[PDB]
Write a protein that holds these residues in place. Structure first.
Motif, PDB file in Angstrom:
ATOM      1  N   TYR A  15       0.725  -1.336   0.217  1.00  0.00           N
ATOM      2  CA  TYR A  15      -0.069  -0.079  -0.003  1.00  0.00           C
ATOM      3  C   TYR A  15       0.879   1.281   0.151  1.00  0.00           C
ATOM      4  CZ  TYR A  15      -3.756   3.373   1.527  1.00  0.00           C
ATOM      5  OH  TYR A  15      -4.273   4.218   1.818  1.00  0.00           O
ATOM      6  N   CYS A  19       3.897   2.494  -8.721  1.00  0.00           N
ATOM      7  CA  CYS A  19       3.635   1.153  -9.172  1.00  0.00           C
ATOM      8  C   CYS A  19       3.441   1.521 -10.681  1.00  0.00           C
ATOM      9  CB  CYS A  19       2.278   0.779  -8.646  1.00  0.00           C
ATOM     10  SG  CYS A  19       1.051   1.581  -8.237  1.00  0.00           S
ATOM     11  N   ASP A  20       3.222   0.572 -11.527  1.00  0.00           N
ATOM     12  CA  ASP A  20       3.145   0.749 -13.119  1.00  0.00           C
ATOM     13  C   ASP A  20       1.994  -0.432 -13.436  1.00  0.00           C
ATOM     14  OD1 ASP A  20       2.983   1.738 -15.496  1.00  0.00           O
ATOM     15  OD2 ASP A  20       5.058   1.760 -15.948  1.00  0.00           O
ATOM     16  N   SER A  21       1.219  -0.869 -12.642  1.00  0.00           N
ATOM     17  CA  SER A  21       0.074  -2.096 -12.799  1.00  0.00           C
ATOM     18  C   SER A  21       0.786  -3.253 -13.235  1.00  0.00           C
ATOM     19  CB  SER A  21      -0.938  -1.717 -14.181  1.00  0.00           C
ATOM     20  OG  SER A  21      -0.177  -1.718 -15.310  1.00  0.00           O
ATOM     21  N   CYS A  39      -3.575  -0.069  -8.635  1.00  0.00           N
ATOM     22  CA  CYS A  39      -2.526   1.089  -8.962  1.00  0.00           C
ATOM     23  C   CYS A  39      -3.383   2.278  -9.686  1.00  0.00           C
ATOM     24  CB  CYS A  39      -1.304   0.650  -9.743  1.00  0.00           C
ATOM     25  SG  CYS A  39       0.123   1.893 -10.105  1.00  0.00           S
ATOM     26  N   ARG A  40      -3.717   3.133  -8.938  1.00  0.00           N
ATOM     27  CA  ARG A  40      -4.430   4.348  -9.136  1.00  0.00           C
ATOM     28  C   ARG A  40      -3.636   5.832  -9.147  1.00  0.00           C
ATOM     29  NH1 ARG A  40      -9.773   3.466  -8.954  1.00  0.00           N
ATOM     30  NH2 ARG A  40     -10.005   5.319 -10.224  1.00  0.00           N
ATOM     31  N   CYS A  41      -3.822   6.713  -9.753  1.00  0.00           N
ATOM     32  CA  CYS A  41      -2.985   8.248  -9.837  1.00  0.00           C
ATOM     33  C   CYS A  41      -3.797   9.041  -9.018  1.00  0.00           C
ATOM     34  CB  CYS A  41      -2.821   8.358 -11.239  1.00  0.00           C
ATOM     35  SG  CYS A  41      -1.797   6.881 -12.188  1.00  0.00           S
ATOM     36  N   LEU A  42      -3.448   9.418  -8.052  1.00  0.00           N
ATOM     37  CA  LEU A  42      -3.913  10.569  -7.361  1.00  0.00           C
ATOM     38  C   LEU A  42      -3.447  11.801  -7.403  1.00  0.00           C
ATOM     39  CD1 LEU A  42      -5.989   8.901  -5.069  1.00  0.00           C
ATOM     40  CD2 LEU A  42      -3.846   7.724  -5.421  1.00  0.00           C
ATOM     41  N   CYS A  51       1.088   7.931  -9.316  1.00  0.00           N
ATOM     42  CA  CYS A  51       0.668   6.787  -9.484  1.00  0.00           C
ATOM     43  C   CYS A  51       0.990   5.563  -8.117  1.00  0.00           C
ATOM     44  CB  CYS A  51       0.808   6.281 -10.975  1.00  0.00           C
ATOM     45  SG  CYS A  51       0.153   7.279 -12.032  1.00  0.00           S
ATOM     46  N   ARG A  54      -3.501   1.885  -4.397  1.00  0.00           N
ATOM     47  CA  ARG A  54      -4.496   2.028  -3.416  1.00  0.00           C
ATOM     48  C   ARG A  54      -5.294   1.269  -3.505  1.00  0.00           C
ATOM     49  NH1 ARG A  54      -7.102   7.267  -2.497  1.00  0.00           N
ATOM     50  NH2 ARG A  54      -8.510   6.885  -0.860  1.00  0.00           N
TER      51      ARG A  54
ATOM     52  N   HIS B 422      -9.409  13.843  -9.918  1.00  0.00           N
ATOM     53  CA  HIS B 422      -8.779  12.982  -9.012  1.00  0.00           C
ATOM     54  C   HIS B 422      -9.008  11.360  -8.870  1.00  0.00           C
ATOM     55  CE1 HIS B 422      -8.697  11.437  -4.576  1.00  0.00           C
ATOM     56  NE2 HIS B 422      -7.605  11.862  -4.698  1.00  0.00           N
ATOM     57  N   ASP B 423      -8.030  10.507  -8.821  1.00  0.00           N
ATOM     58  CA  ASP B 423      -8.320   9.061  -8.635  1.00  0.00           C
ATOM     59  C   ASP B 423      -8.780   8.380 -10.041  1.00  0.00           C
ATOM     60  OD1 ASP B 423      -8.218   6.664  -6.549  1.00  0.00           O
ATOM     61  OD2 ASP B 423     -10.144   6.609  -7.733  1.00  0.00           O
ATOM     62  N   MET B 424      -7.854   8.739 -11.150  1.00  0.00           N
ATOM     63  CA  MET B 424      -8.066   7.998 -12.276  1.00  0.00           C
ATOM     64  C   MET B 424      -7.164   6.902 -12.270  1.00  0.00           C
ATOM     65  SD  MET B 424      -6.021  10.669 -15.109  1.00  0.00           S
ATOM     66  CE  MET B 424      -6.982  11.989 -14.284  1.00  0.00           C
ATOM     67  N   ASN B 425      -7.202   6.212 -13.623  1.00  0.00           N
ATOM     68  CA  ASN B 425      -6.352   5.067 -13.738  1.00  0.00           C
ATOM     69  C   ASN B 425      -4.875   5.264 -14.030  1.00  0.00           C
ATOM     70  OD1 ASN B 425      -8.451   3.122 -13.731  1.00  0.00           O
ATOM     71  ND2 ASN B 425      -9.250   3.573 -15.614  1.00  0.00           N
ATOM     72  N   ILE B 426      -3.993   4.354 -14.729  1.00  0.00           N
ATOM     73  CA  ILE B 426      -2.820   4.625 -15.141  1.00  0.00           C
ATOM     74  C   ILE B 426      -2.868   4.845 -16.856  1.00  0.00           C
ATOM     75  CG2 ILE B 426      -0.476   3.760 -15.555  1.00  0.00           C
ATOM     76  CD1 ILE B 426      -1.175   1.908 -13.212  1.00  0.00           C
TER      77      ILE B 426
END
Ligand SMILES: *[C@@H]1O[C@H](CO)[C@@H](O[C@@H]2O[C@H](CO)[C@@H](O)[C@H](O)[C@H]2NC(C)=O)[C@H](O)[C@H]1NC(C)=O
Ligand SMILES: *[C@@H]1O[C@H](CO)[C@@H](O[C@@H]2O[C@H](CO)[C@@H](O)[C@H](O)[C@H]2NC(C)=O)[C@H](O)[C@H]1NC(C)=O
Ligand SMILES: NC1=N[C@H](O)[C@H]2[C@H]3O[C@]4(O)O[C@@H]([C@@H](O)[C@@]2(N1)[C@@H]4O)[C@]3(O)CO
Ligand SMILES: *[C@@H]1O[C@H](CO)[C@@H](O)[C@H](O)[C@H]1NC(C)=O
Ligand SMILES: *[C@@H]1O[C@H](CO)[C@@H](O)[C@H](O)[C@H]1NC(C)=O
Ligand SMILES: *[C@@H]1O[C@H](CO)[C@@H](O)[C@H](O)[C@H]1NC(C)=O
Ligand code: NA
Lengths: 56, 1307
Positions: A15, A19-21, A39-42, A51, A54, B422-426
């Motif tokens: 956690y 990361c990169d999925s 793996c999400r991008c905040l 990223c 999460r 906010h809080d999207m994918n890669i």
């Protein structure tokens, strides 16, 4: 059960780690139950994103 | 002239000038006593050494008239005095005046910072540098003379009074009068004169205040009547609480009237939920607040709501509650408190105060401010006119089909900024950052290929190519600082690419071509607004700032509010909030810790801020922005027949009332279920029959091209679709049944005045639609920026019920979930652009904006617990949006309806759009003299007893003392208070009896004399109906008291007789101007208010079907909901002014923890439907609040401007009514002829502007009056001869020539 259960292959990411999925554990024992990880991008500034593994 | 000749005639013998300054000039003259070679008309610089400065300015001082210099009056000690010669050469020179403007502006910085000991000694050097300004300027002008004194111009009064206060507050009174120390900030009003163009806006500001004198007295009269009306029907009612029954089996004794009172006064025995600082109100009426089943709803126990400040218990608090309602400031809290305790039929009180208060009298305030600013602009525009009197790159880059490619890339780039959230994918984040590198590489190649085909001598001239070059240099510095974790605010200049598109679609470019043209007008109004906000924020911080710290325990929880006066930034924001229209919530907290002096502060910041300054911004937006052929005969005769069309209209109205009766509790009315069922079968045959009748009458091509018939055709299809469902299986869709309500907008369009109201809406919708699109554009820039500031930052750790934890306990999301709390997001959250749009709507309407702005200034970082006021400079985001999105975009809808309604009323009255305004003043004066008839006098009888009774009835001294006794009867009502002693009420009910017997005498004198004509005056009916019911209420010993005569209905008739005084206000000029505009507009104001009710009926019936079963969240509870028709009209009338729509939204979009509808058990489900709730309220708020409430301001502006224009040039209808009140006393029998001898006495007995002065016979023979037989003249020949006399002397005798052509073409 213990805080830090990887539940996946070696070299996996826990956690709140970048990361990169390809490096993201299937589940994780955080806060009193088993929760999955993705793996999400905040949001971290103007048009910037960090990223991070999460829980979902 | 008046000033341009009197100031020169006083130079002859009384006192001459001394000096002048026009471009570094300083003269040396005298008062014709010993002048030494200043100027006669030499225009030369030969004689003196100092007069050479005032020698080349002979063509500069005479610019417009004298607006280039100022002249002192050398009359006390001018010549042979070397000290005073230095004083002219100090005051006149500009470096002495620019030194004070720096000194004032530095002194204003030391006010916004909290003081210290070095602030005091630095305060003392400003106080001794302003004494030097006074002691030089008094010495060069004299203290007080008649010409040109120091205490004559009202910029030196403010220079002198503020300096004298700085002596008193610095030698004595260090503990008492802290208040006068705070008025040394008024000196900073002097820095208005440093922004170019200020004299247009300050003189419009002065003219607006002095022209509101006639309206402040009329508004204070109307607040007096509504406060006495609210006092008599609402005293004690806001103290109604649910109180527990006296315990029968148990303690508190057995029963005693002293033990019952002891039990009931206990606050522990009153009903509160486990929340709610204030206690809920109840009532005994049929739709009021209901008590839980152990309670009894008593009156008179324990304090009024809002700390005791919201009541009708005394006249002063009723005056504050009524003023709060006209000013529309949180009135839905007063509205919901009043109908919960008195019942829902008291909506009629709120309709009357809203209609005459905010829809009429606050729109007379706007009209006066518009006329004042427009008169100052036409003075300035008239004077400004007097001032006037490499080869292959060119085929690629300059291609018009290449500029189309960049227009695609910009719209793609604007979309990729709105898709960031906010809080999207890669993979979604990878597209957006890769699209960044593509879009910047397109913009670099374009800027290189446009400087090789348009070599940089020419590239930097276009002013879009130099804007685009700033975009490219920001993109490469963003690309160079990309990996750097340093400053990284260069990436925030990506927002500036959005304005590069303005180049392409023209109504954005035509919108910004106005702001870049008239920018100096907007700068002067914005600076005056922020200077007023600065002056009020320093005064209130020093008057009220220490009470918040010293008396902090009086607030709930013992904590400071968010809005207070402790420093400058809080004080600026609490004063800015009052300019947006919210002041009474900040005034409740001010009076709690402070004295009474919070009330003059918050009215004056509301009166100056909202009513004058923001109305000046609206004024500035106006000025800058063979069997087949016989069947078509019968169906055509039926379609045109008048009795047929009344039947079709009557079916549509009767059937829509049936649609309001189907609500909750409908399956408990099983007969009404069968009534509404068979109606749906009769109508689905009625609509089909009336369609085939109109289809044989009108045809095919004229039927399916009309807009009312396509509306008609959809309702036929909707009832054929519901028919074939009920004939085979499926139950009918309830939404398609409600489409028949739209059938009654066509009979609404034919109600004798709706031609002007519906045509200004059909013609406004393409203008409204382009303002929506420009509004969507500018809010998109703020919506992206709010996402980049606040996405993911409105989360917080919360307790088990509702309580936000402290940051010392919970620091992040780890600490919140380790301790088994809940990490929770705000419902208005800026998490993407769609949520930001719904958030930016609540800050622009100022309904919900306080919770959105708490979350913004508490925000720290993602996954951190918010701390209160940790970035308080996020207020700057909201100020910048309210100025450019609320104060500028939403008030642009008012500008649209004002301009279109001027056109659609000129069309409806038959007027042309090619005659000038002066030609239409002349036409209105001719249309009125031809529609004028003499008034026949009421006949005097012959019997002696009833004739005297007529003679004293028509006497003006009787009619004056009849009006004094009505004002005395109602001022006695104003000193009724709640809780008055029984001996006090016995005095006022013996004094009431001697007024009934007087009003009975003067009613029977006016019936004995002055017979059945008595019942034609509309105020003699109310004078009669009150005296009959007042004798009936006192007579009849056996008073029944079972619903017999309401004491409320008797007290409304006392107050309604005060409206006779609106007739006696027709002596004052400015009042008579203003009531006449209300009288002429009152038909079309009712038509707007009746269109409004039909729109409310549509949203009531649709809202009753969408939101009937939702659980009680937000502002929806067991009283205020969508369950019935009557309760829907309660909400939608509150919602019509947008008041409290944020809490209605929170309940009609609540879909969090809701039960699902189960069809088999017969359960409706209590859930919200967020998507349908957005399309319900936003559609309502833009239809009912932006274009229909603003229709009231369009109509009043067109009738006030018409009537004032007749006061200045025309004749003003009352002056025609003036003519026939004096024709009547020389022609009483309505013979419409007088003799030639009487017209010398009639022309003197007239009033201005229509009176002819004595000697009349010199002026009678100058005009030709065609005399009929036996020296008799006609009234039309006299009146038309007088209208020619009025338009001959006003402007010129040439403009007397333009009025014969309406008199010839019409007669
Ligand atoms: C509402 O109605 C109740 C009656 O149901 C009224 O209650 C009475 O109040 C008086 C004092 O005001 C008591 O002495 C009586 O004992 C009460 N009656 C009962 C049956 O409890 C009450 O006054 C009404 N409330 C209003 C008008 O606000
Ligand atoms: C949070 O809720 C959990 C849910 O069961 C509680 O669980 C305890 O967890 C602790 C530490 O992991 C164990 O030693 C206990 O056996 C669990 N049960 C009880 C009854 O304590 C936990 O109590 C809650 N958190 C805290 C801090 O008390
Ligand atoms: N004069 C006001 N009009 C709004 O309708 C009100 C609503 O919004 C708001 O933010 O907080 C509450 C109240 O203080 C308001 N004040 C504030 O603006 C509110 O009742 C909560 O919904
Ligand atoms: C209120 O009631 C409580 C118990 O019912 C009693 O002890 C108390 O004295 C009463 N009065 C006040 C003022 O609290
Ligand atoms: C009556 O009630 C009040 C509070 O409601 C309380 O202060 C007072 O003591 C009571 N009277 C008696 C005799 O207890
Ligand atoms: C509500 O708040 C109180 C006071 O902070 C707290 O003790 C309680 O646990 C909360 N939750 C409830 C009543 O569910
Ligand atoms: Na308020």
């Amino acid at each position: 059960a213990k805080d830090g259960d990887v539940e996946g292959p070696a070299g996996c990411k826990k956690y709140d780690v970048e990361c990169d999925s390809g490096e993201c554990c299937q589940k994780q024992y955080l806060w009193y139950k088993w929760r999955p990880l993705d793996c999400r991008c905040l949001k971290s500034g103007f048009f910037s994103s960090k990223c991070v593994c999460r829980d979902v | 002239d008046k000033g341009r000749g009197a100031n020169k005639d006083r130079d002859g013998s009384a006192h001459p000038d001394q000096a002048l300054e026009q471009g570094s000039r300083l003269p040396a003259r005298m008062r014709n006593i010993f002048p030494a070679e200043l100027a006669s008309t030499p225009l030369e610089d030969f004689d003196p050494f100092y007069k050479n400065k005032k020698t080349f300015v002979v063509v500069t001082k005479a610019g417009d008239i004298f607006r280039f210099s100022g002249e002192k009056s050398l009359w006390m000690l001018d010549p042979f005095t070397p000290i005073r010669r230095v004083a002219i050469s100090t005051m006149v020179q500009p470096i002495f005046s620019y030194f004070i403007m720096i000194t004032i502006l530095i002194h204003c910085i030391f006010m916004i910072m909290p003081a210290t000991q070095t602030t005091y000694i630095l305060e003392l050097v400003f106080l001794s540098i302003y004494t030097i300004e006074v002691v030089v300027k008094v010495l060069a002008r004299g203290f007080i003379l008649h010409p040109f004194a120091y205490l004559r111009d009202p910029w030196n009064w403010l220079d002198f009074l503020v300096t004298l206060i700085g002596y008193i507050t610095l030698v004595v009174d260090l503990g008492h009068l802290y208040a006068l120390r705070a008025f040394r900030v008024l000196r900073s009003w002097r820095t208005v004169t440093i922004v170019p163009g200020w004299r247009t806006i300050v003189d419009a500001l002065s003219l607006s205040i002095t022209s509101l004198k006639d309206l402040v007295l009329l508004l204070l009269f109307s607040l007096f009547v509504f406060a006495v009306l609210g006092l008599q029907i609402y005293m004690g009612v806001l103290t109604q609480k649910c109180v527990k029954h006296f315990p029968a089996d148990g303690s508190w004794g057995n029963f005693t009237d002293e033990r019952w009172f002891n039990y009931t006064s206990n606050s522990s025995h009153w009903y509160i939920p486990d929340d709610w600082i204030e206690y809920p109100l109840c009532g005994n009426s049929s739709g009021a607040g209901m008590c839980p089943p152990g309670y009894t709803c008593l009156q008179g126990y324990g304090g009024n709501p809002n700390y005791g400040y919201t009541s009708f218990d005394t006249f002063g608090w009723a005056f504050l509650s009524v003023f709060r309602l006209v000013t529309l400031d949180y009135w839905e809290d007063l509205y919901q408190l009043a109908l919960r305790s008195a019942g829902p039929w008291h909506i009629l009180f709120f309709i009357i105060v809203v209609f005459y208060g905010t829809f009429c009298f606050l729109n007379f305030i706007l009209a006066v401010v518009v006329m004042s600013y427009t008169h100052m602009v036409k003075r300035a525009d008239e004077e400004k006119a007097a001032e006037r009197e490499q080869g292959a790159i060119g085929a690629v880059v300059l291609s018009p089909f290449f500029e189309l490619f960049i227009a695609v890339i910009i719209v793609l780039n604007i979309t990729f900024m709105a898709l960031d959230h906010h809080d999207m994918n890669i993979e979604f984040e990878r597209i957006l950052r890769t699209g960044n590198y593509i879009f910047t590489s397109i913009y670099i190649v374009e800027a290189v290929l446009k400087i090789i085909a348009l070599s940089p001598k020419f590239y930097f001239k276009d002013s879009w190519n130099v804007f685009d070059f700033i975009i490219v240099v920001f993109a490469i510095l963003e690309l160079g600082l990309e990996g750097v974790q340093g400053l990284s605010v260069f990436r925030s200049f990506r927002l500036l690419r959005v304005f590069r598109l303005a180049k392409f679609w023209p109504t954005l470019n035509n919108f910004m071509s106005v702001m870049t043209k008239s920018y100096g007008a907007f700068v002067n109004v914005m600076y005056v607004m922020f200077l007023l906000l600065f002056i009020f924020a320093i005064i209130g911080m020093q008057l009220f700032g220490m009470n918040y710290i010293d008396n902090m325990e009086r607030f709930p929880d013992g904590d400071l509010p968010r809005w207070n006066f402790t420093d400058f930034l809080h004080s600026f924001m609490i004063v800015f909030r009052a300019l947006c229209g919210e002041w009474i919530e900040s005034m409740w907290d001010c009076m709690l810790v402070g004295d009474w002096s919070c009330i003059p502060f918050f009215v004056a910041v509301f009166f100056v801020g909202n009513l004058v300054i923001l109305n000046l911004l609206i004024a500035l937006l106006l000025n800058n922005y063979r069997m087949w052929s016989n069947i078509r005969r019968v169906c055509f005769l039926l379609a045109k027949n008048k009795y047929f069309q009344k039947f079709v209209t009557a079916v549509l109205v009767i059937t829509s009332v049936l649609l309001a009766l189907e609500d909750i509790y409908l399956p408990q009315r099983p007969v009404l279920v069968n009534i509404t069922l068979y109606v749906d079968y009769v109508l689905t045959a009625f609509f089909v029959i009336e369609m085939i009748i109109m289809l044989f009458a009108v045809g095919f091509k004229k039927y399916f091209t009309s807009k009312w018939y396509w509306l008609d055709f959809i309702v036929v299809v909707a009832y054929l679709l519901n028919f074939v469902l009920m004939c085979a299986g499926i139950e009918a869709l309830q939404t398609l049944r409600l489409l028949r309500v739209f059938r009654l907008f066509r009979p609404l369009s034919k109600v004798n005045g709706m031609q002007v109201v519906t045509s200004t809406l059909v013609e406004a919708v393409p203008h409204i639609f382009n303002v929506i699109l420009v509004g969507i554009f500018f809010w998109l820039v703020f919506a992206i920026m709010g996402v980049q500031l606040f996405a993911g930052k409105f989360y917080k750790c919360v307790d088990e019920n509702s309580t936000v934890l402290s940051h010392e306990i919970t620091m992040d999301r780890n600490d919140c979930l380790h301790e088994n709390y809940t990490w929770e997001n705000s419902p208005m959250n800026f998490d993407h652009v769609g949520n930001a749009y719904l958030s930016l709507l609540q800050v622009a309407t100022f309904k919900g904006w306080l919770q959105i702005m708490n979350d913004a200034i508490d925000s720290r970082e993602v996954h951190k617990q918010p701390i209160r006021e940790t970035n308080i400079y996020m207020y700057l985001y909201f100020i910048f949006f309210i100025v450019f999105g609320s104060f500028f975009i939403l008030k642009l809808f008012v500008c649209i309806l004002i301009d279109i309604f001027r056109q659609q009323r000129r069309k409806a009255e038959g007027l042309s759009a090619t005659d000038s305004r002066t030609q239409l003043i002349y036409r209105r004066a001719v249309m009125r003299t031809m529609s004028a008839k003499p008034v026949k006098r009421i006949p005097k009888p012959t019997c002696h007893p009833q004739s005297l009774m007529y003679d004293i009835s028509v006497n003006r001294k009787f009619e004056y003392t009849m009006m004094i006794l009505i004002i005395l009867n109602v001022a006695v009502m104003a000193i009724d208070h709640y809780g008055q002693s029984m001996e006090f009420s016995e005095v006022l009910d013996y004094l009431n009896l001697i007024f009934i017997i007087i009003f009975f005498v003067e009613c029977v004198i006016k019936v004995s004399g002055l017979r059945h004509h008595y019942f034609k005056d509309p105020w003699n009916i109310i004078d009669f109906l009150y005296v009959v019911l007042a004798i009936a209420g006192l007579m009849l010993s056996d008073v029944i008291e079972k619903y017999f005569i309401s004491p409320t209905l008797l007290r409304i008739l006392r107050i309604l007789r005060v409206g006779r005084l609106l007739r006696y206000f027709q002596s004052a000029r400015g009042m008579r101007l203003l009531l006449l505009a209300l009288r002429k507009a009152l038909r079309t104001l009712f038509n707007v208010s009746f269109l409004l009710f039909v729109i409310m009926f549509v949203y009531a019936v649709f809202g009753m079907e969408f939101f009937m079963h939702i659980r009680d969240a937000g502002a929806i509870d067991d009283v205020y909901n969508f369950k019935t028709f009557g309760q829907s009209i309660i909400l939608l009338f509150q919602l019509a002014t947008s008041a409290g729509w944020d809490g209605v939204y929170f309940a009609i979009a609540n879909e969090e923890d809701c039960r699902a509808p189960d069809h088999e058990l017969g359960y409706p489900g209590n859930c919200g439907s967020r998507a349908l709730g957005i399309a319900y309220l936003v559609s309502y708020l833009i239809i009912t609040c932006l274009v229909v409430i603003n229709m009231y301001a369009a109509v009043i502006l067109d009738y006030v401007l018409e009537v004032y224009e007749d006061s200045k040039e025309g004749l003003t209808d009352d002056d025609y009514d003036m003519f026939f009140e004096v024709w009547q006393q020389f022609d009483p029998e309505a013979t419409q002829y007088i003799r030639y001898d009487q017209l010398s006495e009639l022309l003197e007995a007239l009033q201005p502007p229509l009176q002819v002065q004595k000697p009349n016979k010199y002026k009678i023979l100058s005009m030709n009056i065609p005399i009929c037989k036996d020296d008799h003249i006609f009234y039309k020949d006299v009146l038309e001869a007088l209208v020619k006399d009025v338009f001959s002397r006003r402007g010129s005798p040439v403009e007397a020539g333009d009025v014969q052509a309406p008199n010839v073409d019409e007669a």
